[PDB]
Amino acid sequence: MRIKGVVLSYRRSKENQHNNVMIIKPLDVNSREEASKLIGRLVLWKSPSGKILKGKIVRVHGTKGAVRARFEKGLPGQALGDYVEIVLEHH
Numbered sequence: 001m002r003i004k005g006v007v008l009s010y011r012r013s014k015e016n017q018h019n020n021v022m023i024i025k026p027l028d029v030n031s032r033e034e035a036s037k038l039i040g041r042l043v044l045w046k047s048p049s050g051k052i053l054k055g056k057i058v059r060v061h062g063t064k065g066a067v068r069a070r071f072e073k074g075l076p077g078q079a080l081g082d083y084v085e086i087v088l089e090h091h
Contacts (some may be wrong), residue, residue: 001088003028003038007045010065016027018074019049020053024084029065036060043069048079057086 003026011021026041029035035057043055055071067086 002044003086003088005029005067005084005086007077007080007082007084008043009080013070013074017070017074019055019070020074021070022055022084023061023064023066024069024086025064026086029067029086031065032060032063035065035067038067038086038088040086040089040091042086043067043071044072044087045069045077045084046079046082047073047079048074048077049075051075053085064077 005024005026009023053071053073055069069089
């Protein structure tokens with residue numbers, strides 16, 4: 001299963017762990033429960049660089065089902081409105 005989402009916003013990782021954060025609103029996930037069972041799942045975002053960065057849903061945002069994912073590559077984008085695919089990893 002891959003869930004389709006819209007990156008509402010990005011956050012520049014100023015931390016030691018340079019993992020580019022994003023406020024994703026999954027079109028299928030509009031409940032807190034459906035979002036909370038996605039903690040750890042692998043999000044595939046398409047960077048403007050023409051690369052598919054892999055990320056991890058670290059925590060959800062409210063009851064809206066909007067998930068917040070940190071991407072290992074930590075590469076910028078500012079592609080506000082771009083689409084992701086949340087791979088139901090389940091480790």
